[PDB]
């Protein structure tokens, strides 16, 4: 109540992409936070807690080395830019039919102004795992 | 905001060490929390949320097995001690030129008194990766 909040999950009815959803049970979008073009928009200035987790799955391992990344980025309303708040990199393969799974989690506390737009991004969507529930999500909460 | 808060990042202008900074954009130090000798000092008793994440990078793998750790520890003002609040261990190598990356994240909620000092530490600073932004950080928030 009177506390902006959002918690969105991936879109399972999509392939090779990452679309957030808020029309599912056990998902949240309340008190002014808006999802506009895969981005949650801060409704009022203040401190916020930002978190996001993704999971990658892969059968076998590529001949070439592969590096996966997960990032969360800001967009200042003034002096339009895109800074990197939280980021992480992981490498699943080490050499060379069993599958492998890799989770990545990020979270932090940041001070944001009104109208800033946050976005969580990856680099190899074809490796993403959005089959089950609660395996990919991204959210913010005001304090 | 009358809410003690801190979010500090590593120091890129350092080698083989881990020094926190609060004089960067998108970093926080407000409402009584103090950074004194690589430590965050609680300004008032209450419940706090404590989090921290680090990233290790390594070319190849050593002949000997290497274990990396990330811990968060508390120094009580009375009966001076150093207890372990959150900790984790990881091992990236299993046999025997491509690089590897490993992230570690910790977070929890604890009740702290006034003047207790928190510290986040690792064991192999030469393996740390602080080149980019948002890859290493440590922070607390009061609530």
């Amino acid at each position, epitope marked *: 109540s009177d506390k902006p909040v959002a918690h969105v999950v991936a879109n399972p009815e999509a392939e090779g992409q990452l679309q957030w959803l808020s029309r599912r049970a056990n998902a949240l979008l309340a008190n002014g936070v808006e999802l506009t073009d895969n981005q949650l928009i801060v409704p009022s200035d203040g401190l916020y807690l930002i978190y996001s987790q993704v999971l990658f799955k892969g059968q076998g391992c590529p001949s070439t080395h592969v*590096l996966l*990344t997960h*990032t969360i*980025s800001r967009f200042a309303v003034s*002096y*339009q*830019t*895109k*800074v*990197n708040l939280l*980021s992480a*990199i992981k490498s699943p393969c080490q050499r060379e039919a069993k599958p492998w799974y890799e989770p990545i989690y990020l979270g932090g506390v940041f001070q944001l102004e009104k109208g800033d737009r946050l976005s969580a*991004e990856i*680099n190899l969507p074809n490796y993403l795992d959005f089959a089950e529930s609660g395996q990919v999500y991204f959210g913010i909460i005001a304090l | 905001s009358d809410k003690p808060v801190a979010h500090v990042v590593a120091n890129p202008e350092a080698e083989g060490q881990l020094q926190w900074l609060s004089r960067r*954009a998108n970093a926080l130090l407000a409402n009584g929390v103090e950074l004194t000798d690589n430590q965050l000092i609680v300004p008032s008793d209450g419940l706090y949320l404590i989090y921290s994440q680090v990233l290790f990078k390594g070319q190849g793998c050593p002949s000997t097995h290497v274990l990396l750790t990330h811990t968060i520890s508390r120094f009580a003002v009375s009966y001076q001690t150093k207890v372990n609040l959150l900790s984790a261990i990881k091992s990236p190598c299993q046999r025997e030129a491509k690089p590897w990356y490993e992230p570690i994240y910790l977070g929890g909620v604890f009740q702290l008194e006034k003047g207790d000092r928190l510290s986040a530490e690792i064991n192999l600073p030469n393996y740390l990766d602080f*080149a*980019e*932004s*948002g890859q290493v950080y440590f922070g607390i928030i009061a609530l």
Partner: nanobody
Amino acid sequence: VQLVESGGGLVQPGGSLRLSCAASGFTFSDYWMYWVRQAPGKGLEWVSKINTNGLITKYPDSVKGRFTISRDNAKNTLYLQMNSLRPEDTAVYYCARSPSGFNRGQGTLVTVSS
């Protein structure tokens, strides 16, 4: 906070050019970087987007397949590699912090004369 561009010239069709940008006055290892192009008699459109650690790359469909973007954070520089050019890629090119154009000190002309 200036960003100098270079690498321009004339390329006969089927060739390969390579532009470049430098930066100063800000932490180059933070912001996403954008290669934008302004064409004579047309609007201003972005041609490339790259993120902080260089593992996220984005192109429009009119350009995708023939360009390559990159950066070096130690030297505070951003690149652009040109392959199999066409007369459509005859315009001025800027390096900026926003896909719509922002903080583009100079621009370099690339003409593909057939």
